[PDB]
């Protein structure tokens, strides 16, 4: 029993973290096969960040201006290319620790594990989710850019995130491994709006399911409701509108606990309307939306 926020085992990703330095700027990079990926603003100065023309800034750069370091090993760059907002440094040495990997662009609401790094060395690992407004609330100090987010399917590491910047509001924005930002953000030191963030309703429902599996069942109420009527309460509280696809994903959770999805939707409607009265669910005094239905089944079956 027990239910906690879990992250994937970071061992496979650790062996791919390198330190990339260019001029005076330095950050982290991802070394897979004979290519090293890092955010393209490693070629910027502090003054460049205000308004960079990345094309022009990269023309003034040659291979020997890029210092990739793997612990003590110095990797020799033999080719460079810009793909959207990431830099691709070709190197003469393939990585012997390269795991089976894929590049995926994940959907809002999905979760992944972040391996936060500084100077190519991992310092910790945590879990978070793509907010509906395509930001993430993580832990990123200066020099943590180039850290990646990932999932694991048995032996295949699915890379889906790279940290590029912190917004002035304190939340974080990045790209996939092809270079494209999640959301309307650019790699430029300017004020940028993330927009109204909503709550991943299907994720909260999966969390309530996990609570019932782990003894916490007080929120189970008498009432039921309809999709439309529940979705009207969801709009008032800035929750994502629940669809029948969302009901289909919660099916296996419904079958294991014998509680219909609409029944849990009514318990959630009362929690939204009547608060929590000072009680907790799984040790939390608010509703947790960073657990996908897949995350719960992961932890309730091993």
Chain-wise SSE layout:
Elements: H1 11-14, E1 17-22, E2 25-32, E3 35-39, H2 54-59, E4 66-70, E5 73-75, E6 77-83, E7 86-91, E8 100-103, E9 111-118, E10 121-129, E11 148-153, E12 156-166, E13 172-175, H3 201-213, H4 227-236, H5 244-249, H6 251-257, H7 261-274, H8 293-301
Helix pairs in contact: 3-8, 4-7
Domain Peptidase C30: 1-302
Organism: Severe acute respiratory syndrome coronavirus 2
Active site: 41, 145
Structure overview:
The PDB classes it as hydrolase. The entry lists the keywords Mpro, inhibitor, complex, hydrolase. SARS-CoV-2 Mpro in complex with D-5-96. Helix 4 runs parallel beside helix 7. Helices cover 23% and strands 27% of the residues. By secondary structure, it is α+β, with helices and mostly antiparallel strands. The chain is elongated, with a radius of gyration of 22 Å. The chain has two domains: 11-175, Trypsin-like serine proteases (Thrombin, subunit H), CATH 2.40.10; 201-301, main proteinase (3clpro) structure, domain 3.
Major sheet strand order: 5-4-1-2-3-7-6
Strand content: 25-35%
Shape, please?
A: elongated
The CATH topology of the largest domain: Thrombin, subunit H
Cα-based radius of gyration, to the nearest Å: 22 Å
| CATH classification, class level of the largest domain | Mainly Beta
Could you state the order of secondary-structure elements as H and E?
Answer: HEEEHEEEEEEEEEEHHHHHH
Oligomer: 1 chain of a larger assembly
Structural class: alpha+beta
User: What's the CATH architecture of the largest domain?
Assistant: Beta Barrel
Number of helices: 8
Major pleated sheet: 7 strands, antiparallel
Q: What name goes with the CATH superfamily of the largest domain?
A: Trypsin-like serine proteases
Number of strands: 13
Distance between the termini: 11 Å
The percentage helix is: 10-25%
Count of spatially separate domains: 2
Organism: Severe acute respiratory syndrome coronavirus 2
Subcellular location: Host cytoplasm; Host Golgi apparatus; Host nucleus
Protein name: 3C-like proteinase nsp5
Active site: 41 (for 3cl-pro activity), 145 (nucleophile)
